[PDB]
Amino acid sequence: AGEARLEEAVNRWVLKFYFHEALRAFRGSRYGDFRQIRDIMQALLVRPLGKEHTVSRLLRVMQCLSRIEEGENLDCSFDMEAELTPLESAINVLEMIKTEFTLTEAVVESSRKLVKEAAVIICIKNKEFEKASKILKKHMSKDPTTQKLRNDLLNIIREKNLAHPVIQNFSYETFQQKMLRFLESHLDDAEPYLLTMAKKALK
Amino acid sequence: GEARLEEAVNRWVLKFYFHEALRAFRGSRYGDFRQIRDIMQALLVRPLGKEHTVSRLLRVMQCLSRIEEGENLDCSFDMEAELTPLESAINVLEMIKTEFTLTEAVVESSRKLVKEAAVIICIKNKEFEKASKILKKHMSKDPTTQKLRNDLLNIIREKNLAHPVIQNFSYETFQQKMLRFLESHLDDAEPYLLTMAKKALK
């Protein structure tokens, strides 16, 4: 009751606050700060939070950014079997986000295209062509908006052509920030209660 | 201002979870305590500014953490030892004595309990050499502890785990006495986040 409902309320404020700081850190390319804040939120999620759609949505976005942040490390794994690269995992998270945010396919398709493209290109950049082909086959063979790009990538892989413009013009920093603006555009962009209270208290 | 806003919130959050940790410990909810401890640990990596109150806070939090895990001898809190968690608790207790500017006579009573408990746990885990070493280095007082210290010396040599002193020992009773000791040197006031939550939910 009014002892556990107090704990749940504060835990929600604390979570929502660090979520905001995590986004600010990511936005400023401060990924060391992001990873530290992520670890705080990780320890926080096991606490009672009640059942809000808002903390669930929060965590999915937080999951996507985490996988994108580690996206250039193909030796890193988010599943206990190391089957998937972080960007393959990010694709799975994005679909959960589309569902939970009740998004239209037209709204999601452009940014999903970005993640798929990045997943393959990183593999190519690391000369992991078998992996590139697999990801390409599993994520672009049956996707209407990716066909034009899918065609460029097959040829790049088969010719082992790292000097192709599609590869050379790719910027992972640019990719990350594009994904963030997409995710932030579907977020309640209001300042967290704790920050607002701190602004009053220090005023 | 900038950055000083983060430190302010970080302090409120630390102090709040400190308050919850004590509440969980008081209700013998050690699972909840451990989880809250892990949150506070993850926070230590962030900027907090520098308050004397949080230093004192963290020391108490350190003592309770070692006491909570005191029965797990495969657990280690220091990276050079070889110290059992309750041995670490003894070291923390001395930091608490200094930093709280407490007198030896006030601290003396509660430290005996930790020394008593540390030795008995080694005995319960059949770690007699460790038990002897701890006994020899710490419980070596002489006055009111003579009768008990002699009991422990005899038990270790005979490996008599069935001795009443070993059988009648209650760790739950020990923990709660330690918590109450530590709380007796603590302010007292409700954490700001809790107060705000009260005015928010009425």
Binding site: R30, Y31 | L44, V45, R46, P47, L48, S65
Partner: peptide
């Protein structure tokens, strides 16, 4: 991409 400010010795966990 910092972004601490402390050091350990305030270690709570093991």
């Amino acid at each position: 991409e910092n972004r601490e400010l402390e050091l350990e010795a305030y270690r709570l966990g093991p």
